[PDB]
């Protein structure tokens, strides 16, 4: 069927039309998935390894094609798209490694052998975002397959095309190794229908959701008796102490601020800079931001592409307007061409709307402050995903690292840093559970404790 | 200081004393207060946590016989079993002390970056504990919570709260000794549906750790909201006896599993599935051992089986036994009651019997004779998945059953009742979320922080 | 170099395949001095570069699989189907090393006001001395973890089948060049074991010795190595136990594999079979009948099950051991025949006192002892060795009792002693070894821990 | 033999003979090992609960005898009483930690299709423990506690320079064994000449593992004589402590005073040299000498004593000669350089990188200070044959990490001296300073062998 328009966020053209499943169709797919739980649960290690490795092989073989899809559909600059594709290859490969290597444990006992075994949770409901639709899908699908789960997967309608390609890739791997196709199910359509059904359905055993904090919170209220993993967003504070290497902090913060036009859960949300160096930092940072190439994601020279929709870009514009109304000083940008939003920098105080709002936009509030106020400002939000500190001081770096109420603390690089094999996630309203393949596999399985009593 | 709620001796039915019952508004105030102490708990040094935990254990040891007597009087637990529970609780606190010092974080390899993890408290842990092992099951929530730097709001079951009140005084003594504000640990007594519910629902509580009925656990998942959730629920635990089982050993093990604490344990034997070829011999042997059990006063040293926790429960169990007999269940022993004192009761039934899908929390044992190829299916046929057991000397069959039994625990050659306190413990399906055992509970009661140091 | 000093022999035809360099001690010393110059380069090689080199080695091996397999057949006398399996394993070993460079975990230890963490660093120069029998995968098991852990390598391969190691050395050189690493980080040193291998053992610049081969040589190494880390993978007379309740068809098939894979020239090959008296006749008949039909001949033939022993010299010696075994009262049941180095599957029934029960023959010569259960553990543990043991039984209690009481680095239940999953920790106790292999385990042997303490 | 009075035991402060103890012949050592062999099965099969109980009871007895044991350290080892108490407290902790690891140590399961693969740790057999004079109670505990925990029989030679606390510990172990009905033959204290009794433990083919703590010279000879045994060595070094120009000087001085002068410098991780940036060298030296000046040097039984005597007059005389040589080579004496029998006073010299003190482990309160530039420091620090502990004082993130990664040592301490050891951390040296790691959990791994068990499924 051809139900739902898929849009190129740069040109605004309809790229194509895809199926939008009804709630009853979503229920049907879940019923089908349930029938294959036994097949997946019993799939040998060698078979899961082979499937995961073959998925990585196909992605590698179609790397440029997949990167182009990310550029056209997600608006992702082609150089950045290639990086995401490369990461997705790594993710499937690492899950293949862990099928073979994941360790269970033996616990000492007099006259008993006590050991653990991990078994699938059953049906994993994977709900993936528009921004890194390929690698973030890989971060749910790969550990799910690794742990013998059946999958129902709803991708974001804002950039579904790479996920459709991944589903075909998965289907090929499954066919190659004689596994029924019903073990993996891509369900496209409205989030509030298909996504909602995955969350609510009593046959689904676990929800793994990456996306907005608002939606994540709603899931906790509607999911019922299921395991729940949430990877949400935040307003990620990046702190520049008076002793920081300023050139290196600027370069790091340009990346953290403007990669994928700020549409990353760990994008820079606010910069707190010591008053003594604030003028110099601000000048250096604005000057570097000025020279970024803003435009067509398909162009090799493009640094910053469009936001995912005009509707979102319009919303960002109003937020920047509100920020200026509250006394924010515009230092760069604040301009918009349809969905193409230009790098925008303001100096604001800690009470500004931008300090409390995740904009998913290339909009950067800078707060000049004393060291004594920084931790309090950094911790002042309802979120707690990533934070960062730039300093050369051992004592200060450790004090900040301990006291920052965040799932991740980065020293001398921006909040945007994630090494794919590290445990990754947020506290407060920013998440539940940790991702990264090893960690996701642990969430996507249940422990069985086996006790053999000795005569 | 309020005398609101009766506490009952389930053997004599006498009111032992009256304790406070907090209103919802009083529970909210207590949670608000606890919130104030999150920072002090979070920053308590390792040495201080260690010292607090060891001193709790020391105090429990000192009062061991006194605490055991309270379990007998208040929970109806035979004194020999009460002493075992107290000893376990000492171990639980000491193990938490060990882990505060020994729990390991990790380093992830990276070119030109130092990446390592750190565990931090979840914040306020809401601990809701059951009447059946109210001392050690409280220890299994409190000890790891203190170890991981959490503030605690704790609601104990009203059916046997007295030992929890004594433990609270003990914790208070330890906190005073090491100059920690008392507000870091809070015992909130009263109606489960008022105080326990408020702990579950309140937005300031960061994590719920509940042990008790499956029905209540299910409801908690719908009402908790944005919180970490650990649930230790129940089940109808199938115990499987194959053709080749050592029958003497299986009988002895299953007597314990069936009748310890009058079957009021989440991992108590809920059904026995026995091979047809040995069913007659097994059943005769099993009934004959159950016949000689001493039923009576929990304070008596020779007592094997004490009362159920309430008359109300005993009356309900009686009804279920009646219904089981209505459906064709064959009464082999017991089926008699003296107020809350319920006698060991054994029936032969088929897989469709009400007892095969009802958690009775009672000394009532359905036995199904069947064939091997049916056993896994019957075992897996409930909505629950806590513990299962198999008695066999066959390697291939033991592994087949171990893999295929849909349970959080599978016990080979001992009953479902087995739990070593330092093992990961918990259920699948409607029997739980998360694992207990101090090391595992600590992992649930903390969040990971990933720290990345970028090198030149 | 380009010198043609030492004959390399095809053990089937006994023809000289070619001549290779035989390094002098002074040339070995010179090579070790070279390796020393590159310790700093290797120690600082980034993770990505180590990963890339190891994956590229696996890629090239895969691309040359059939060629490498043919070399094993011609040089080691290994039947071609078995040769392919070795090559396949070696690809996996390099790949697994690649993944552990990325995933290996260090730890963080709790401390008030201090961050304490570990860091693994290379031992420095790893001296690898590899055997003739699995020269490719056993070289992979030393080289792959060495590179992963940032060590320089000096490697002496067995002169009895050095050709595949010369090919692996070229593959290593290609990978090093591709990623701009000096070739001096890996050095293949061919020649006499007692000259070149000995220099590696004795040289004070070598930091660790990893040796796989004869127990005699391994013992010598402990006396000659001095102040170095030492890992030894030696042999044994591996006992395989068949209890009266074993699945006989399965035990026979498993034991045919364990007895006759690579003509018994494996450190974990079946050294003796102990069989319960009650089933001894049936077992022996079944085992002899399966052994009878094995195809003995040219390893290049796809049909061949059993190729030649590695030398005429060794085959002559085995023949004398068999003669002595017969002298002692051994009963010849099959074979005993020899054609140059081609030794036919040979089976004797003997008693526990026979020379075969104490002698590692590295040959297709299988002593069978009929006995009772209670004597089995004592017979099995009666040697100076302790590599692998196996037991065939369906009995849980007996399997657990034997597993605990067998004095061996490995205990295999319901498969023969020959079993080794490449990712399991592998090695021996008593005179059979020091340390464990398998990539993750070798990486630990080939690194030193650094504890770093940051005081706050 | 228990009644024999063969060998003098000396108080290093008064030089008085405290008492005379047995010295076993090689043949008596052989017999003790033969007898220990007979109890290998008993120890190997001792239940977890029994091992736990024995370990906890040893800890309980040490705690009940704390003051007495501390006094023995003062009198026999010359250890200031305040430091003796600390050692005793650590030893209680070591036995308790072993108790918890008997219960908590984890084995692993490895994935396999249709196979259950798991590991089991089993004892090495007979552990030959050879312990030093300097921390004779806790360093004995660091070998005994893990050995018992892992089901090994023990033959234990304590240093004859301070054996009395080890005789006391042996009685304590005997009491615990008796209490829990274990034969006394599972643990054997063998006193006498190191070159007789220690040598026999090293060479005897029935001993399965050697764990030795002491001089690097003796450690090296063990590697040449042990043969086919597992070997763990905890040796010494000349431990470099580096003070960068951005260091907190007050903190560095306090930390280095402890590291330099605790137990009169007779610690394997004692400060061996201080490298200090040229730019701050004068200020640091003045502060360091001034704090060292006010240390109380005297009778270890006095509560006020900071520094007691060296373990022997022989050693003190040798140290005197080394200081003389250091001065001959151009070393500038800043403090001390004086001896009263075995009582050696805090001694500080400014020297260059080529001075004898930069290459010599003195086990004495003698501290060479070398002023240099930052870029020379790693090379000077790494220039010895040893590699136990190093330290760096700095507030700079990048520099701390650079030094931490490039210092060729088993331990690197940032902002405390080389003397730091948390008992639960893996502890040991590279180069000539060791093999293996101690710390209960780590020693348990060294003192056991892995068994891999594979259950093949149908």
């Amino acid at each position: 069927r051809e139900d739902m328009d898929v849009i190129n966020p740069y040109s605004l053209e309809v790229i194509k039309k895809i199926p939008a499943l009804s709630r009853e169709e979503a229920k049907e797919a879940i019923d089908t998935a349930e029938k294959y739980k036994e097949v997946m649960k019993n799939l040998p290690i060698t078979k899961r390894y082979n499937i995961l490795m073959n998925i990585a092989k196909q992605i590698k073989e179609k790397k440029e094609e997949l990167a182009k899809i990310l550029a056209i559909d997600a608006g992702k600059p082609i150089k950045q798209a290639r990086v995401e594709v490369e990461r997705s290859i790594g993710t499937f490969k690492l899950a293949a490694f862990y099928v073979k290597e994941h360790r269970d444990e033996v616990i000492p006992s007099d006259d008993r052998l006590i050991f653990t075994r991990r078994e699938p949770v059953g049906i994993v409901g994977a709900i993936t975002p528009f921004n890194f639709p390929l690698n973030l899908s890989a971060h749910k699908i790969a550990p799910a397959i690794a742990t013998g789960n059946v999958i129902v997967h709803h991708p974001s309608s804002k950039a579904p095309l790479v996920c459709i390609e991944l589903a075909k890739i998965i289907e090929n791997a499954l066919k190659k190794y004689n596994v029924p196709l019903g073990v993996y199910n891509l369900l496209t359509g409205a989030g509030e229908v298909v996504g909602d059904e995955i969350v609510v359905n009593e046959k689904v055993n676990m929800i793994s959701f990456t996306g907005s904090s608002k939606v994540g919170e709603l899931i906790t209220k509607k999911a019922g008796f299921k395991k729940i993993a949430l990877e949400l967003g935040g307003v990620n504070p990046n702190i520049v102490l008076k002793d920081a290497d300023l050139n290196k902090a600027v370069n790091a913060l340009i990346k953290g601020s403007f990669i994928y036009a700020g549409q990353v859960c760990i994008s820079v949300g606010m910069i707190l800079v010591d008053e003594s160096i604030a003028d110099k930092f601000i000048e250096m940072f604005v000057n570097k931001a000025k020279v970024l190439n803003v435009g067509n994601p398909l162009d090799e020279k493009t640094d910053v592409g469009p936001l995912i929709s005009v509707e979102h870009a319009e919303w960002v514009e109003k937020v920047v307007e509100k920020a200026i109304d509250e006394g924010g000083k515009l230092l760069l940008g604040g301009k918009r061409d349809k969905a193409l939003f230009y790098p925008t920098i303001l100096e604001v105080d800690r009470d500004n709307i931008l300090c409390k709002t995740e904009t998913f936009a290339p909009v950067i509030p800078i707060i000049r402050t004393n060291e004594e106020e920084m931790i309090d400002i950094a911790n002042s939000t309802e979120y707690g995903l990533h934070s960062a500190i730039f300093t050369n001081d051992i004592n200060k770096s450790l004090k900040f690292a301990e006291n920052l109420e965040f799932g991740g603390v980065v020293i001398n690089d921006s909040s945007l840093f994630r090494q794919d094999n590290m445990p990754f996630g947020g506290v407060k309203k920013s998440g539940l559970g940790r991702e990264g393949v090893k960690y996701a596999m642990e969430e996507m399985s249940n422990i069985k404790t086996i006790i053999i009593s000795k005569a």
Side-chain angles (χ1 to χ4, degrees), chain A:
Chain A
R1 297 203 302 264
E2 286 173 57
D3 299 313
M4 194 172 56
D5 288 355
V6 178
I7 308 305
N8 178 325
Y10 190 70
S11 69
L12 301 191
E13 293 175 345
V14 175
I15 314 166
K16 64 147 94 273
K17 283 179 75 61
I18 68 166
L21 280 79
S22 70
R23 151 153 1 247
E24 192 46 68
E25 287 170 320
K27 286 189 187 173
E28 175 180 328
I30 293 168
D31 284 349
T32 296
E34 182 196 24
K35 298 184 192 174
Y36 294 105
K37 287 177 73 181
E38 285 304 309
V39 165
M40 252 339 278
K41 179 182 187 190
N42 285 296
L43 213 61
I45 291 159
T46 294
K47 195 152 279 196
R48 282 168 277 170
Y49 173 88
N50 286 340
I51 287 163
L52 294 161
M53 284 304 307
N54 187 252
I55 292 169
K57 185 173 181 277
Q58 290 178 75
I59 298 171
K60 184 172 168 89
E61 283 172 342
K62 298 158 153 194
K63 177 176 178 188
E64 188 65 14
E65 174 181 344
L66 296 172
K68 293 286 174 172
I69 293 170
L70 289 171
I72 287 151
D73 185 20
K76 182 169 294 207
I78 187 66
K79 294 179 291 201
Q80 296 176 42
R82 292 184 187 120
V83 174
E84 181 186 343
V85 178
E86 200 60 33
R87 314 256 286 199
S88 80
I89 296 164
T91 298
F92 278 97
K93 284 190 175 188
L94 193 61
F97 168 84
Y98 276 112
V99 186
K100 294 196 165 214
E101 296 302 303
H102 135 89
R103 295 303 207 260
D104 297 303
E105 59 173 345
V106 181
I107 301 194
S109 186
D110 288 325
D111 306 307
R112 296 178 203 260
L113 175 71
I114 298 178
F115 68 100
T116 60
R117 171 181 171 86
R118 284 189 171 267
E119 300 192 339
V121 295
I123 305 181
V124 169
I127 303 176
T128 53
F130 75 83
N131 61 342
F132 297 72
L134 181 56
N135 196 36
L136 293 171
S137 291
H139 272 291
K140 303 185 191 299
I141 294 165
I145 294 172
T147 51
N149 295 286
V150 169
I151 302 153
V152 293
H153 173 207
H154 170 81
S156 174
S157 297
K158 307 197 185 101
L161 293 185
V162 84
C163 296
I164 291 164
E165 291 313 303
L166 182 59
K168 294 180 190 169
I169 282 162
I170 293 160
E171 175 183 315
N172 288 337
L174 294 174
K175 284 180 166 302
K176 180 172 175 76
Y177 296 101
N178 298 129
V179 179
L181 302 184
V183 302
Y184 173 82
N185 306 267
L186 185 72
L187 310 183
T188 55
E192 40 286 286
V193 177
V194 179
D196 185 74
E197 186 55 33
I198 293 163
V199 172
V200 144
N201 197 287
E202 299 199 305
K203 298 185 179 286
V204 181
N205 298 107
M206 170 162 178
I207 305 298
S208 173
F209 169 83
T210 300
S212 91
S213 299
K214 172 180 85 176
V215 175
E217 172 134 45
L218 288 165
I219 292 177
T220 65
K221 302 186 188 293
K222 281 165 70 82
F225 204 138
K226 287 180 181 72
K227 281 191 88 163
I228 302 171
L230 304 175
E231 183 165 286
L232 313 169
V235 189
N236 306 300
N238 289 244
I239 294 160
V240 185
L241 295 198
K242 65 169 161 277
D243 73 312
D245 184 320
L246 286 197
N247 190 251
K248 294 201 195 153
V250 167
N251 294 332
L253 287 164
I254 288 290
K255 292 170 49 178
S257 293
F258 306 117
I259 278 286
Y260 191 50
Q263 304 177 112
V264 197
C265 58
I266 55 185
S267 290
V268 172
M270 72 186 108
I271 299 174
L272 310 183
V273 63
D274 193 274
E275 293 181 356
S276 73
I277 55 155
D279 290 339
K280 288 188 290 297
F281 174 83
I282 286 167
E283 186 184 34
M284 298 164 74
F285 182 71
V286 168
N287 287 353
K288 290 291 198 192
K290 279 181 181 182
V291 296
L292 293 167
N293 289 325
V294 184
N296 197 334
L298 285 166
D299 197 317
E300 296 289 341
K301 284 192 192 179
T302 296
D303 293 314
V304 180
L307 295 178
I308 197 66
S309 66
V310 179
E311 293 68 39
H312 189 243
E314 285 169 348
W315 176 83
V316 177
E317 200 172 58
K318 280 93 215 146
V319 178
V320 167
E321 295 188 8
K322 182 73 177 82
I324 295 166
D325 254 67
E326 296 176 348
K329 186 185 172 206
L330 187 67
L331 302 165
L332 183 68
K335 188 64 192 169
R336 171 178 77 85
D337 189 353
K338 298 162 289 135
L340 192 70
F341 210 102
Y342 286 81
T344 297
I345 301 166
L346 295 87
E347 183 172 354
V348 308
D349 72 36
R350 69 174 292 176
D351 288 318
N352 193 278
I353 189 68
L354 297 167
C355 296
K356 295 284 155 286
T357 311
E358 176 174 38
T359 59
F360 248 55
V363 174
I364 309 301
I366 304 176
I367 318 291
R368 83 177 63 211
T369 186
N370 55 276
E371 189 169 307
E372 288 74 32
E373 200 176 5
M374 292 172 175
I375 284 162
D376 287 334
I377 295 167
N379 284 340
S380 75
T381 80
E382 274 184 318
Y383 311 112
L385 191 45
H386 271 198
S387 58
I389 179 160
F390 293 84
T391 184
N392 290 306
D393 186 303
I394 294 174
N395 295 141
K396 294 181 179 183
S397 66
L398 303 181
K399 164 201 178 210
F400 275 83
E402 284 180 22
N403 289 335
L404 281 163
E405 294 167 352
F406 290 86
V409 176
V410 191
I411 295 158
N412 291 332
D413 193 0
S414 83
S415 59
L416 174 69
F417 178 82
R418 173 196 192 181
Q419 184 167 296
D420 263 352
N421 75 338
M422 83 189 202
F424 172 71
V427 300
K428 295 184 176 179
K429 294 274 180 66
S430 294
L432 289 171
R434 292 297 176 276
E435 285 197 354
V437 164
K438 191 184 178 184
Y439 306 97
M441 286 174 63
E442 290 168 10
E443 319 269 355
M444 291 178 178
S445 57
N446 293 318
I447 297 173
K448 173 180 282 171
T449 305
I450 303 166
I451 304 98
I452 303 162
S453 311
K454 310 172 147 151

